[PDB]
């Protein structure tokens, strides 16, 4: 339903590591056609395989209140969407573009204000 461009990024967040390894993909937000629990899976879809990371293609359902939104997790590298999953495997994502969002880090994850609205709005919803 909502397509936006993104790639995968490092699993680790024990020591808050972030290293972009150039990679390509898509995220697509669907409110689940099946509507099993209505919760909004982000299924990522590969164009280049993960590397250097535990991450794997999946369709991962987002639980209201047990998934927190963090705008930035690593000062070392920006453009990182941080999706922290309580006991359901964390996943981190990176804006694949390197010609976009070279804006200084603030609420940056690709874009500042735009992403901040999107993420919160989704967690609250259920339908």
Swiss-Prot record:
It comes from the Eukaryota. GO terms for molecular function: ubiquitin binding. Its main location: cytoplasm. GO terms for cellular component: nucleus; proteasome complex; proteasome regulatory particle, lid subcomplex; proteasome storage granule. The keyword Magnesium does not apply. The modification Phosphoserine is found at residue 127. Belongs to the RPN13 family. Component of the 19S cap proteasome complex composed of at least RPN1, RPN2, RPN3, RPN4, RPN5, RPN6, RPN7, RPN8, RPN9, RPN10, RPN11, RPN12, RPN13, RPT1, RPT2, RPT3, RPT4, RPT5, and RPT6. The 19S subcomplex associates with the 20S proteasome subcomplex to form the functional 26S proteasome. This is 26S proteasome regulatory subunit RPN13. It comes from Saccharomyces cerevisiae (strain ATCC 204508 / S288c). The gene is RPN13. The chain holds residues 7 to 133 of 156 of the full protein.
